[PDB]
């Protein structure tokens, strides 16, 4: 078999993984999502189904005032003596005053017995020094954290809650920049510690150094960097922030985060999660495809293929959300439902547009492609100015692309882009009353929306030729982590009205 | 229980004859210069359908080879009576020929069989070219009788249904409108009514009927005339007529019609397809279909278990013969193209002709059954000399097509060349590497591009075009576009001769 990069597409940043049996376990970072940390599951490292989340409660994380781009950055999940930890990094809006100090970052520990969860609260470590924690269990089973800048080490109590002693930064990198998510691994006598380096933009790599001591001193891999992308117009780029794993049949593997460029420098759907062999070197290293750089197509892990259950359509006739939706910021439970029209995804009004950072129940999943179709069947009444329900592809609050059905001097169906905080109406069309459907149709940076009243004959309402604002460095923001989304939403505009819109189903369909 | 969206067999599927056998219904459609010849179709519940054959699949029974786009196998009629399937239809020639001594333009075909999927007997042809669409119909007494235009002329055959016996008889002429064609008996409550396609299968297509009595009249039109066409331009369905009646195991009335759907604009691009809509005695003794309303856009499901079938949008060619949604382009050269030389793949070998030339050979195609939909390929294509190419094209005849190849053409180049009403035109030239390749089209109502990939989840512009528009009946401009637009695979060597082969590992439809 062979396999093409990424195997995880889609917003599936910063990867981390380990191996239990014959099992696979990968944490991505969410950020402004919830719930927060995405936890997938392999047999073959090459497909990957999302199987839970780290944080689901409200209680346990507020991101309702989050800003775009900060919350939940990368995440480390580890297993040890039949617990599932994962560490990150809590990034706030800016300098805080916790329990008497002043941080921007905090760092998260959640743990549970099952890889699923349900994980225990988030225990804040308030340690704002830096990013990217990473669990590490030396052999006589003491506990650590690293983290950020480069390799520093923080000593933790056993049951991983606290730090206990002074940290030590036991390698400082290479000098490029932003040395970030740090990792050790111990194998032949050496500790191996990786690093992140570059930044995630188009100079991201990994890079290593090894010593025969936990506490160094480490000397650098003569390869380094031991993966990055040196080819510019390749259509993978930004690779780095890797995570090792060995598999039951011996092979080594690596995983990483990087960028697929869209018509130019635009991560469309964000960083995703890419694959590539790791080869160990008989003077005692390792490297990544061989120096070669991200592979486009790779020989597969010498592993069973087992495929999954993609569930690009959803119905909705389950009184609990499919795993693959995320919430833009925390739910408003009492706003949406499943089991009040069975069959149906409600979403009742909000009082907030897009834009607005307290807009509540935007439910939206990944774009996988970069050629896809996602459309909704709806059923919804609006009756006063601006209440509005339809399907959005989604970047930030200043960046997002809507087709809905809304209330503006009689039902339309509108198109309005938000183009880096610049909103404009791209279509409006008069409507007719009774159940619609609406489709988005993306091909590359052009993006189209069309409406039908029976699913047959389409119409088309709006669209740009230019979506480029949908990405991480086309949105302009201040921070782009995340990814373009695609999924529903509801509001009100402001009525103040609680209006039922029903959504009979999903569809995405990658052509 | 049930609703369903008009129309019910979509993608180039005109005239249709449809006949309840038992618990099942069979239909065909005309094909003009398609290979294999009259398309047979098969449902249980009226609404979805799949192919199970062809009426003519055999290259010694029906020569296409020359025949000209449009032109061939016209409008075809299926019935049953006592253990046979008939099916007649009018095989129009590219002019007036000669043929044992007299001049026709047009001959009509009968074939039979004792199974609807066939095969079925070698054509017979019945040298009487003074119209078109023969419909059979057999009295009460059991003597068959051939329906043909102009409007409903009644001609008696044999009981073989292999020649002429009488003289004609006109029984009905129709309205007055133009081109009175596709004619039925039918015969229910003591009358004979009779059915014809009026209007012309263009924008003013419609249903008209009339009863008598007797077989061979007086008729009486119908006061509700037309009982289908579409009135309102701005519908998305048009072109409504060339129906034909069926009667359910329930006792409920149906008929089948053909209709085009316009794609931004009076542009057929599918061709015409197959509606469906409900058939209303009236307590005075007629027939309506819709309730005068024309075609429905959704409508109520006939009251019949619904069976949906396999589409077979994937074919990954594992199989050694070839899949019933495909047609050749004209009669298949069986030499160069193969599903056993390489198995799990479909060989074309390159012929001399490039798609303009009405002599290409072996142009691979289904149907567009949407408007939003991509196809790609996974090609194995080695051109080593100018002109051999092999690729995807979307086809609606030799003067309007889009193709998109891995060409030899000093180096290897990925090549898209769209051919408008004659006029050819690369629209785009990107140099290709060697080996395996991936090609996609992206269908978006009259937009239409074209991507490669080296390995399939890259994919690159190769080139496209704004406006598809001369890909439909109306914006062809060719004498005759009776047909539809296809997608598929081609290969040629340029006109050199060369022998090369193009294998294609898979053909991938998606509606979006
Ligand atoms: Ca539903
Ligand atoms: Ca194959």
Redesign the interface.
Known sequence: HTY??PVLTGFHPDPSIIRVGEDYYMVNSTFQYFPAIVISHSKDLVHWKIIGHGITENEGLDLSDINDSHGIWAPDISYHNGTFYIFATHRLNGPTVINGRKLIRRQIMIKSSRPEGPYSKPVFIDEGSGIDPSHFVDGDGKHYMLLSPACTLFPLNEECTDISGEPVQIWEGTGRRAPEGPHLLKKDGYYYAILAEGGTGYSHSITTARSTHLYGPYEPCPYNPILTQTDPDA?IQRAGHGSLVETQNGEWWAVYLCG?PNQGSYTTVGRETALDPVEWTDDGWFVINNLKGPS??QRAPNLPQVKWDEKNFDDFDEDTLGLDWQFVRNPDHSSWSLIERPGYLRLWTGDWDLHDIRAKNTVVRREKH????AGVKLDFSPSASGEQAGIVCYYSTNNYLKCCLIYEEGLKIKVVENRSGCQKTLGKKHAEAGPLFLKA?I??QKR?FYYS??????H?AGGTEDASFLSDEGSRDAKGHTGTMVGIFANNGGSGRKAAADFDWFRY???
């Open positions: 093409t990069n259509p697929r486009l197509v970069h050629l896809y179709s149709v091909n590359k189209d009243y029976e699913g047959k004959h389409w088309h369909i990658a052509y």
